[PDB]
Design a protein around this ligand. Structure first.
Ligand SMILES: [Mg+2]
Length: 113
RNA sequence: AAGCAGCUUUACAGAUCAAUGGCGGAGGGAGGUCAACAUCAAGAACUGUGGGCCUUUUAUUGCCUAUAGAACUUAUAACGAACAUGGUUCUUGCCUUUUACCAGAAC
């Protein structure tokens, strides 16, 4: 096993470095999702219960989505629908219509966060 | 517009009473505080069908063109010359808290 592991060579990859730092959340940044269709923007959820949408090219703040009362723990954008799904420590699961920037559906039944 | 000739013919009477073609007949009408199914808000916005068309063979759809038929609804835009409630979010009001609520918006 060690022979056949040591003979092989890993592929080279270029190093990473820091490009930009964005501040504007009031709590810890807990989740990120990229625009899975056009790569134009990304969204972040936070301990400050908001969600913020960021222009990926300039890093500037597009809009703030305020629809949770506790930490937004995860965010997911659908590639087949114009929908953002978000979940929180406040036990709610919410769908946002990105053609209006409004909650349109709540999904109920989780006992805990 | 009536008197006469042409079209229509039908209550009839014929040649014909054969060979034809025309229009009907081979399961009736009016109703029901009966039912089921289909359909009713959209490029002013409809479906079928003949020929041509991008999907690599244009198929059934989307496009061009020819043509037959469109019931209901609608421009001081809606089936309803009528008019309720509820959910979510936002902003207000009353406000000791929730329900029940104040009244505007959006979906
Ligand atoms: Mg209490």
């Amino acid at each position: 096993r060690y022979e056949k592991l040591l003979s092989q060579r890993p592929e080279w990859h270029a190093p990473w470095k820091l490009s930009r730092v964005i501040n504007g959340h009031l709590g810890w940044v807990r989740c990120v999702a990229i625009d899975p269709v056009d790569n134009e923007w990304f969204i972040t959820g936070s301990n400050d219960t908001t969600m913020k949408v960021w222009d990926l090219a300039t890093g500037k703040l597009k809009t703030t989505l305020a629809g949770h009362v506790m930490t937004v723990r995860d965010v997911a954008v659908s590639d087949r629908h114009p929908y953002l799904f978000s979940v929180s420590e406040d036990k709610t699961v919410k769908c946002w219509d990105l053609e209006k920037n409004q909650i349109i559906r709540d999904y109920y039944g989780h006992l805990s966060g």
